[PDB]
Amino acid sequence: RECISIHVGQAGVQIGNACWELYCLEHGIQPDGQMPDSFNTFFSETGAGKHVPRAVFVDLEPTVIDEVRTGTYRQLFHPEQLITGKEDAANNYARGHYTIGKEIIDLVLDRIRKLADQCTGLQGFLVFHSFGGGTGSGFTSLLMERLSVDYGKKSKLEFSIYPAPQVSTAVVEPYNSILTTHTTLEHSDCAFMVDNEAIYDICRRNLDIERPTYTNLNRLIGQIVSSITASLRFDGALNVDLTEFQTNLVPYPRIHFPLATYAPVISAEKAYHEQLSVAEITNACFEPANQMVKCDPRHGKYMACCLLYRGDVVPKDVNAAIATIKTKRSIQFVDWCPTGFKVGINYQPPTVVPGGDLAKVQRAVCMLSNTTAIAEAWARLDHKFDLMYAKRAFVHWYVGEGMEEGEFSEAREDMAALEKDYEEVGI
Amino acid sequence: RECISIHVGQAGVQIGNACWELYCLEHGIQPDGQMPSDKTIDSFNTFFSETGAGKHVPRAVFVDLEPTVIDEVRTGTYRQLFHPEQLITGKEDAANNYARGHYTIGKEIIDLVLDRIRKLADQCTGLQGFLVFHSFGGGTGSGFTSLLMERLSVDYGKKSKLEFSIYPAPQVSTAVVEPYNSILTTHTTLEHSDCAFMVDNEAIYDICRRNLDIERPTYTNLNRLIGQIVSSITASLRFDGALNVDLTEFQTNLVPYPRIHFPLATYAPVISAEQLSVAEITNACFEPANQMVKCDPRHGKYMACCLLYRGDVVPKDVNAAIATIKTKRSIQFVDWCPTGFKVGINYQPPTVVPGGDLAKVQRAVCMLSNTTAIAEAWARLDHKFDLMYAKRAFVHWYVGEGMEEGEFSEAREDMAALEKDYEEVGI
Amino acid sequence: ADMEVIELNKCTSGQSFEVILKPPSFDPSLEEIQKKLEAAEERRKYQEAELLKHLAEKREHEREVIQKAIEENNNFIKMAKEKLAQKMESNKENREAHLAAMLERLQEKDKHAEEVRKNKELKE
Amino acid sequence: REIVHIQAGQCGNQIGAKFWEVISDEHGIDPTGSYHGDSDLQLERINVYYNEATGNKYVPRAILVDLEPGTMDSVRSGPFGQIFRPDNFVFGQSGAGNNWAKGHYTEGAELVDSVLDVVRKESESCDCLQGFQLTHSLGGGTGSGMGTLLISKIREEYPDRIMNTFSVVPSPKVSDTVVEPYNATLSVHQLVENTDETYSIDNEALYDICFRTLKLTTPTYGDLNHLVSATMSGVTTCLRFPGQLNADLRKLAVNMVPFPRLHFFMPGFAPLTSLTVPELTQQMFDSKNMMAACDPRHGRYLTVAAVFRGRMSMKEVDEQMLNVQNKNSSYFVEWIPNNVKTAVCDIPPRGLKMSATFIGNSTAIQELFKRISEQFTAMFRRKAFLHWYTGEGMDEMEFTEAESNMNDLVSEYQQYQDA
Amino acid sequence: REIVHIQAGQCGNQIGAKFWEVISDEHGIDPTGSYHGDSDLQLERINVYYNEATGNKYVPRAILVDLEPGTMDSVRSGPFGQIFRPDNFVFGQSGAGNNWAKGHYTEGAELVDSVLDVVRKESESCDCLQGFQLTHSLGGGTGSGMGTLLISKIREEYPDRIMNTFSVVPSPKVSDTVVEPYNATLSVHQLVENTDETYSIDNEALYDICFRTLKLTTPTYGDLNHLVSATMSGVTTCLRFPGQLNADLRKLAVNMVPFPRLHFFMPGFAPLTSLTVPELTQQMFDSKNMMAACDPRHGRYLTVAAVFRGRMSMKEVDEQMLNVQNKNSSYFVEWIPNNVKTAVCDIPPRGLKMSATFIGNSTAIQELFKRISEQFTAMFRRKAFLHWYTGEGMDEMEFTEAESNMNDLVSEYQQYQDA
Numbered sequence A: 001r002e003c004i005s006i007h008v009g010q011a012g013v014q015i016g017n018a019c020w021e022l023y024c025l026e027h028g029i030q031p032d033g034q035m036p037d038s039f040n041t042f043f044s045e046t047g048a049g050k051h052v053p054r055a056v057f058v059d060l061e062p063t064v065i066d067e068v069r070t071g072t073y074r075q076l077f078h079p080e081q082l083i084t085g086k087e088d089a090a091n092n093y094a095r096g097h098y099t100i101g102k103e104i105i106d107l108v109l110d111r112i113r114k115l116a117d118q119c120t121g122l123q124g125f126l127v128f129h130s131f132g133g134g135t136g137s138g139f140t141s142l143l144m145e146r147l148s149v150d151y152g153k154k155s156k157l158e159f160s161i162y163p164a165p166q167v168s169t170a171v172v173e174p175y176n177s178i179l180t181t182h183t184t185l186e187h188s189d190c191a192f193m194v195d196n197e198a199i200y201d202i203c204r205r206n207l208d209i210e211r212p213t214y215t216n217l218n219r220l221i222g223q224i225v226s227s228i229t230a231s232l233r234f235d236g237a238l239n240v241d242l243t244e245f246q247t248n249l250v251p252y253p254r255i256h257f258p259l260a261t262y263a264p265v266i267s268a269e270k271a272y273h274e275q276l277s278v279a280e281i282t283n284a285c286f287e288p289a290n291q292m293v294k295c296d297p298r299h300g301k302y303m304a305c306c307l308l309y310r311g312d313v314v315p316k317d318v319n320a321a322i323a324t325i326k327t328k329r330s331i332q333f334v335d336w337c338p339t340g341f342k343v344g345i346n347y348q349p350p351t352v353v354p355g356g357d358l359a360k361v362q363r364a365v366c367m368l369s370n371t372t373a374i375a376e377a378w379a380r381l382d383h384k385f386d387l388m389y390a391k392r393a394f395v396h397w398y399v400g401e402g403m404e405e406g407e408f409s410e411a412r413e414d415m416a417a418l419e420k421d422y423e424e425v426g427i
Numbered sequence B: 001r002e003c004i005s006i007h008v009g010q011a012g013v014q015i016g017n018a019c020w021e022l023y024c025l026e027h028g029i030q031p032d033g034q035m036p037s038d039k040t041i042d043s044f045n046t047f048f049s050e051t052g053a054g055k056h057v058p059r060a061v062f063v064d065l066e067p068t069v070i071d072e073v074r075t076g077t078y079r080q081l082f083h084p085e086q087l088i089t090g091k092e093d094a095a096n097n098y099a100r101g102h103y104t105i106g107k108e109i110i111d112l113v114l115d116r117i118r119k120l121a122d123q124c125t126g127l128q129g130f131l132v133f134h135s136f137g138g139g140t141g142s143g144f145t146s147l148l149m150e151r152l153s154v155d156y157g158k159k160s161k162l163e164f165s166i167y168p169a170p171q172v173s174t175a176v177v178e179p180y181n182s183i184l185t186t187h188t189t190l191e192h193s194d195c196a197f198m199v200d201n202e203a204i205y206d207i208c209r210r211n212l213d214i215e216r217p218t219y220t221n222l223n224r225l226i227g228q229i230v231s232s233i234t235a236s237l238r239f240d241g242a243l244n245v246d247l248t249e250f251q252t253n254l255v256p257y258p259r260i261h262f263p264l265a266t267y268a269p270v271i272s273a274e275q276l277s278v279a280e281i282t283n284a285c286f287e288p289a290n291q292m293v294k295c296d297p298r299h300g301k302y303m304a305c306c307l308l309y310r311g312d313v314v315p316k317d318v319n320a321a322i323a324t325i326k327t328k329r330s331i332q333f334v335d336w337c338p339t340g341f342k343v344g345i346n347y348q349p350p351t352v353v354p355g356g357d358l359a360k361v362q363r364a365v366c367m368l369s370n371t372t373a374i375a376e377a378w379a380r381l382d383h384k385f386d387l388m389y390a391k392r393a394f395v396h397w398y399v400g401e402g403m404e405e406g407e408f409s410e411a412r413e414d415m416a417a418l419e420k421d422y423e424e425v426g427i
Numbered sequence C: 001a002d003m004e005v006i007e008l009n010k011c012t013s014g015q016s017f018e019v020i021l022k023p024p025s026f027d028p029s030l031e032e033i034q035k036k037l038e039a040a041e042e043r044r045k046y047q048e049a050e051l052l053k054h055l056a057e058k059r060e061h062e063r064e065v066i067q068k069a070i071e072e073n074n075n076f077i078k079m080a081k082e083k084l085a086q087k088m089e090s091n092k093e094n095r096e097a098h099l100a101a102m103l104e105r106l107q108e109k110d111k112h113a114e115e116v117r118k119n120k121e122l123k124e
Numbered sequence D, E: 001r002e003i004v005h006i007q008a009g010q011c012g013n014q015i016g017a018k019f020w021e022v023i024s025d026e027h028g029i030d031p032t033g034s035y036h037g038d039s040d041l042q043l044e045r046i047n048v049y050y051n052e053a054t055g056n057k058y059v060p061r062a063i064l065v066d067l068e069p070g071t072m073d074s075v076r077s078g079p080f081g082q083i084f085r086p087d088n089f090v091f092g093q094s095g096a097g098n099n100w101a102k103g104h105y106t107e108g109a110e111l112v113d114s115v116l117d118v119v120r121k122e123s124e125s126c127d128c129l130q131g132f133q134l135t136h137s138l139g140g141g142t143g144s145g146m147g148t149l150l151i152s153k154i155r156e157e158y159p160d161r162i163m164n165t166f167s168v169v170p171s172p173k174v175s176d177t178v179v180e181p182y183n184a185t186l187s188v189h190q191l192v193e194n195t196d197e198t199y200s201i202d203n204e205a206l207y208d209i210c211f212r213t214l215k216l217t218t219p220t221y222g223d224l225n226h227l228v229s230a231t232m233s234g235v236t237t238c239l240r241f242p243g244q245l246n247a248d249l250r251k252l253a254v255n256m257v258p259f260p261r262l263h264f265f266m267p268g269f270a271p272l273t274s275l276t277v278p279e280l281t282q283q284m285f286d287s288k289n290m291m292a293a294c295d296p297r298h299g300r301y302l303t304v305a306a307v308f309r310g311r312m313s314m315k316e317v318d319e320q321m322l323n324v325q326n327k328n329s330s331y332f333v334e335w336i337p338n339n340v341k342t343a344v345c346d347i348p349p350r351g352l353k354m355s356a357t358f359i360g361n362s363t364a365i366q367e368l369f370k371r372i373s374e375q376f377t378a379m380f381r382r383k384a385f386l387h388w389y390t391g392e393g394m395d396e397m398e399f400t401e402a403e404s405n406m407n408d409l410v411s412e413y414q415q416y417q418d419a
């Protein structure tokens, strides 16, 4: 029925900021708030004019959350759904989860309940956060534990920003990610990983931006997100509810991390070119070059595929284009699973930001696939980690906030297990 | 900050007299008192106390146990230079024996002095130390000095004492009993004094024969040459300086050890009136023929060197002057003082007495070196002593003032120790 | 592949549907643990109140060097003041009663002028 | 989020007064007056170095400490002298020293409080104190001694906040003064315990940068200080400027220092004296260009951080950078993944159209420490000028006890050339 | 600083009255009147011999003592007779003696007081009394006997100040008497106890010095006194003159006398009768020229002091001087280092363009003493003229007791030809 957004931590917020903007452009809410159920999914029709998101934003420095209450959309949120922490996270799980987190954690948890209080039959939570990064791993994890307690059934859906060398990481990133994803895994239901590498890579191949910004990246992530939610703020069969999510993408409780693929990212100025074919957009989907976690699934196996088409599209085509995707490619569905394909068409044409870099399109695909190769990312983190922790590398700054040396061990120990589970799903 | 002069005893005074004269010629104070040099309503302040609204009065006190010499001051011009009080005189003479000045005849005046020096350090916000000029051998010069200094040590806890001894030599007439006097004071006085510039009278007289070509060199002849060495040692903190350096650093450099160490004095260009190279003047310093205590340090080892240049010099020059005063000369730097060769330049030209014997020069070096061979002087005294005391020689005149037979022993006993300490600094 | 597709749901703003391509063939978050967050909280106040009551170690060792000096000084002052003055009542006592060890050895070849001139007023 | 600046001791004060008038003129600040510069950015993070007072005006959060008049009134009467808040000058009056103990015990502890009472009045004033940064000499006393003490007395009063220093490790060239090894070794010890990062400005390098590579015959403290002043503006840049990163300085620390033993960064610069990008990096990673007297060759990089300056494409920088850690691939430890990161701010320094600066946690810094403990044990050998401290109230064994800590530091660095 | 002059007994008085009129005319003094001499120096230290009175006028600090009129009115009516202060003449009246005891006990002590009451007057008048010097004969009575007593009664009243005497040690050739050895030995004893230095003018030398070397057939007390008067000017010079040294006379003592047993100097002179520098020293250090009858050859010099007179270069003197202690190197004890010192005053004596005088603590002076105890023990042998003292109130054994003290003195000197 209702669907709260929690965006913790710089990345999470900035992502959140530029996909609420896209939700607004899609549903036609001029910033102030007013539009000239249906899309009640995400908005709480507050007062007798405005539309206010069902959002809460937490970060442990102001700064970023500050830019929201400064730039237009400044009238979009309630002043209280924006929480800010004064003292920074300092780029380590240890801080956010225990030291500096403790402090603010009871405020947030309160406010999200204020928001789910005006909700007859709330569904779940969308949680947007950074994989590596201070509060992003730390706080998120903590939030999520306590969420699990305060809200028993209610699904949690995480959208992690898995980090990559160039779009600048931090030495200590590896730790943070392994750390959270341990604690956070048993508490979260489905998790859309987003490889920053992938996105940046798409902005270079496709958009032709030599030096892609966050604000550049975010825009492209903004769309993937809109397209995954879409189905439930419009209501257009498939993923019309949160259960129905992991119901279709993960068959294995182990929070599985579906692969994100977006359809036609084409740079405006190439706008009035040709509208791409129902077939072809699909055909991009099954392309490494267009993925969303730097990997490849012509090496792994598929365990559930989901195609999310948006626009003017008739099933007849989708079918008869899949046909030839099967006839002309690397099928590779694993051992004990149909050969998936739950296909949803959402007749709503895919709106893009106006000064944005991509162009208005006709029709876009989305592709949500649970592959065992998504664990090639799982491993690449782990190595970096293994080889630092071999020497206690930075360990101390965390023992310093007050963690256990063995919470590092007992978390790697989990990744090793999950890295093995995934691989153990092979034929 | 401020720096009191005490000149005790004929030699001390007469030396003092002809270097307050030199100070005055350097800073431009016409005997009258006043200096056309713009105000004083600091720097030139280290040594002078701007008394009344005209005059400049030294921070000096002169004690001696006969009038006679002190009398010469309040008679010859500069008669207007000092305050009447700062000149103390004793009526009954010293009689040329430590015993007298330290006990019998000193007792009497000692309290007077001690008072008046305090009157002088009373108008001094943050007085630094004392310069004490005295004779090694010689009645009050050994005796009174010694007493003064003990008591100074009590009345002024920290405040360093800087002695300028005039170590005595056979020709510029000594006295039979000299040896005793010197061994005696230097004992008592040693644990109370901080650094001591020995001046061998022999050396000076020697320099006045080689260089000045004076067949029969006076005290007034000698003093003039010592006047300069003193000026150049104080200099540093007398004029401001900027592009260089105070004692206190030169002090930390010279004396690595408790034992008051007695730096060698060497002057640069003594050339008789009626311009030498930056390199050459230096080369003079490392010469037996130009030293301040007859001896040689191509036989001892060095434990710290200090070069004090004054006048038309540039470092680019001193650099090569030194470097070469090593490439092919009397090297020898000892087991553990990696440094040695501190170096400053007190740009102010080396102003010499007008009817004096030396000429205005361009640039002068000064070389303050603590060598173990300076103890070759230590011994030459001791032998003279040993061989007299072997028979109680003159002992009695001292037992007669009221000394102990064993204060002669218990003081030799120290020289033997010091003579050993010095030699024990070898590799 | 030639499809066979079963349609689930036909919304207002959309259509979904399943399309199998080849039959598959085969066969407590629990609250209590926040005491594990005041398990940090009291491992981190240790960490600190250690290297705090450990910099309070070096603290009044300052009270010490700033003392072993001042105390070191009055041991020199108020030690070699009577290491002087008690070698100078030692001095007085030594001559002040030797200028009188000279006098009584005289007043004796003196009280001897009288006791042999009061013997010349007895002789021839 | 906000940092106070302690600047103590003759050398310390000199350096900091150049630091100040460089950055002040970067942000565009008058002797007193406020902004004058057709840029805008500047004021964004002006906050971080500049607690502001009456009317317009901009006053640096700065505490000037020293044990003797002169060198403060050297600043007061000179460059940006009118700038610093007048009762922010803590005079000594007394003897200074040129002797650690004086500054760390007798003559120092005499003041400390009165400084500490003003740091309190700036930090307690601050909206959210990030930490303190301090400048001083390591040889000689009133900087090295009072300093090491200020900080020892700052932690304890703020364990909370982090400690930053610029410490000028002194040399045999550029000053005689038989004792510094002692003072240095007595501090290095202090430093390793109570700071979180320290930049080692080796005077020895500084010299050589002016003479080995510069032709500057008569080297001032002046030109040579001009080198530090520049290196410092660079090191700090992205705390006080843009919106590239944000740089908690805690962030800078928790990213630069793998090992609690506060590892000292040797800094580096690009162009110098008183530029192509390839020609910039290959120069910023040259030994003959390091701010500390090493050759980061005998020893590897633990972590590196480089920050560039001027409107140049970072297309070319990512690429030059990854390219150094390739033609030099071995000398970046491989147990810490992306251990060299870069940042780009495009507002030029003094003259200078391009520029870069370099912060390096390098085990080769060991070569520096060894060489101070080298002339140390050569002296403390036969207990040299030690009686200068003995008498001021110190123990014989506090030297061995420091000599031995430092020796450890050397041998933990020497250890982290591992596998 | 200031000295009084006691001058007692026929011989003493004679000598002193020649002393006085030599120095008086050196400083330029009239019979009474003051200065007349185009020199200036003179008056610097005139202080030391000349307490001054009414108006101009200059009067010598002098006490004239004797036990019979004549020899005073010999001065009063003669040379500079108008000079001495009139109630400074202490007449005897009574028998004189030519017999120690008379002068040291019976007829002497009779007076002593009246002398002592005037020495008190001059000394208690003096600004800072340096000491007394006294002139007298050793043989015969009223000088030797009263003297030895004046001094024995002067010390005790001034232990403080030092004792100085010119004592004319007599002989068989040139005597008033048989008995002198007795008188001499009785004084020599007294001298060795209560003076600090004595100059031994041996009449025997003086005679040999006028017949072996001076063409004079039978020498008066005149040409002969003449020699002492010159030697005494010589000895004193640098108390009463320049600004060469200053010569506390205490200084002179504590430098000339190693051993408390007041060791007696034998004086010497340069040119004589009534000069090249080399030809001056070789003469001043010739035995045939000593003021005491020895041959400073049989015995060594303990300490020597030589003082030269006239405008001559001391370039040459230091050099001649060190040259005597080289061609005679063995006869200066080598256990007292620089035990021969020289001084130069450049204001000539009587006639005489050059000159020197010589003071010598020489163990050869033993030869003198031995030769007076020689004729003593030859007499006191079989108690000769002893009943001349016996009866005046003396004990038999006071002679042995003196003979034996003197004998010792001989054998301490004889000891200090040591190693």
Ligand SMILES: CC[C@]1(O)C[C@@H]2CN(CCc3c([nH]c4ccccc34)[C@@](C(=O)OC)(c3cc4c(cc3OC)N(C)[C@H]3[C@@](O)(C(=O)OC)[C@H](OC(C)=O)[C@]5(CC)C=CCN6CC[C@]43[C@@H]65)C2)C1
Pocket (backbone or CB within 6 Å): B314, B315, B316, B318, B319, B320, B322, B323, B341, B342, B343, B344, B345, D172, D173, D174, D175, D176, D211, D217, D218, D219, D220, D221, D224
């Ligand atoms: C930047 C501050 C500085 O200017 C650096 C040097 C020292 N002083 C400034 C003044 C100065 C220098 N030289 C002086 C000589 C006399 C008086 C003053 C100076 C200075 C220079 O030449 O500037 C033009 C300088 C000094 C030295 C100097 C270089 C130098 O300018 C190049 N040397 C590096 C050291 C030196 O001791 C050393 O470490 O040798 C390895 C060196 O020894 C030799 C042979 O080089 C030398 C050179 C003469 C020798 C003896 C004294 N020590 C002191 C330090 C050292 C010097 C410059 C402070």
Ligand SMILES: Nc1nc2c(ncn2[C@@H]2O[C@H](COP(=O)(O)OP(=O)(O)OP(=O)(O)O)[C@@H](O)[C@H]2O)c(=O)[nH]1
Pocket (backbone or CB within 6 Å): A008, A009, A010, A011, A012, A014, A015, A059, A060, A061, A088, A089, A090, A091, A130, A131, A132, A133, A134, A135, A136, A137, A161, A162, A163, A164, A167, A168, A169, A170, A173, A196, A214, A215, A217, A218, A221
């Ligand atoms: N895709 C994307 N990634 C971001 C964005 N901002 C930061 N990141 C990434 O997130 C990681 C850093 O996480 P942060 O959000 O900066 O850390 P945080 O604790 O959540 O925020 P802070 O408290 O400010 O440190 C790095 O991997 C970055 O590459 C963003 O806007 N978009």
Ligand SMILES: Nc1nc2c(ncn2[C@@H]2O[C@H](COP(=O)(O)OP(=O)(O)OP(=O)(O)O)[C@@H](O)[C@H]2O)c(=O)[nH]1
Pocket (backbone or CB within 6 Å): B008, B009, B010, B011, B012, B014, B015, B064, B065, B066, B093, B094, B095, B096, B135, B136, B137, B138, B139, B140, B141, B142, B166, B167, B168, B169, B172, B173, B174, B178, B201, B219, B220, B222, B223, B226
């Ligand atoms: N250099 C130098 N030495 C002197 C001078 N005057 C005396 N001396 C030396 O100092 C020593 C003598 O010191 P004095 O001043 O005579 O002894 P004093 O007792 O302190 O002073 P007095 O009371 O006058 O005896 C001898 O070694 C002399 O050579 C002088 O003017 N210059």
Ligand SMILES: COc1cc2c(c(OC)c1OC)-c1ccc(OC)c(=O)cc1[C@@H](NC(=O)CS)CC2
Pocket (backbone or CB within 6 Å): B172, B173, B174, B175, B176, E235, E236, E237, E238, E239, E244, E245, E246, E247, E248, E249, E251, E252, E255, E256, E303, E304, E305, E306, E307, E338, E339, E340, E341, E342, E343, E359
């Ligand atoms: C009366 O004035 C005299 C006073 C003195 C000396 C002296 O003999 C030359 C005198 O003349 C007779 C004198 C004497 C002797 C020494 O011992 C050999 C000596 O070292 C030193 C001296 C005199 N001093 C000097 O020769 C040092 S310049 C000081 C005392």
Ligand SMILES: Nc1nc2c(ncn2[C@@H]2O[C@H](COP(=O)(O)OP(=O)(O)O)[C@@H](O)[C@H]2O)c(=O)[nH]1
Pocket (backbone or CB within 6 Å): D008, D009, D010, D011, D012, D014, D015, D096, D097, D098, D099, D137, D138, D139, D140, D141, D142, D143, D144, D145, D168, D170, D171, D174, D175, D177, D180, D203, D206, D221, D222, D224, D225, D228
């Ligand atoms: N570069 C820099 N270093 C200096 C400066 N002044 C002195 N130094 C160095 O630091 C050491 C001592 O500094 P100083 O400030 O005088 O010590 P302080 O007594 O603590 O103030 C010297 O040995 C020099 O090597 C300065 O002007 N700038």
Ligand SMILES: Nc1nc2c(ncn2[C@@H]2O[C@H](COP(=O)(O)OP(=O)(O)O)[C@@H](O)[C@H]2O)c(=O)[nH]1
Pocket (backbone or CB within 6 Å): E008, E009, E010, E011, E012, E014, E015, E096, E097, E098, E137, E138, E139, E140, E141, E142, E143, E144, E145, E168, E170, E171, E174, E175, E176, E177, E180, E203, E206, E221, E222, E224, E225
């Ligand atoms: N040379 C010198 N000796 C004298 C003179 N008069 C006497 N004597 C000697 O001194 C001794 C006795 O002196 P005299 O005065 O008669 O004894 P007095 O009665 O004590 O004064 C004799 O041995 C004389 O040789 C004198 O004029 N000059």
Ligand SMILES: [Mg+2]
Pocket (backbone or CB within 6 Å): A088, A089, A090, A091, A092, A133, A134, A135, A136
């Ligand atoms: Mg963070």
Ligand SMILES: [Mg+2]
Pocket (backbone or CB within 6 Å): B093, B094, B095, B096, B097, B138, B139, B140, B141
């Ligand atoms: Mg004297």
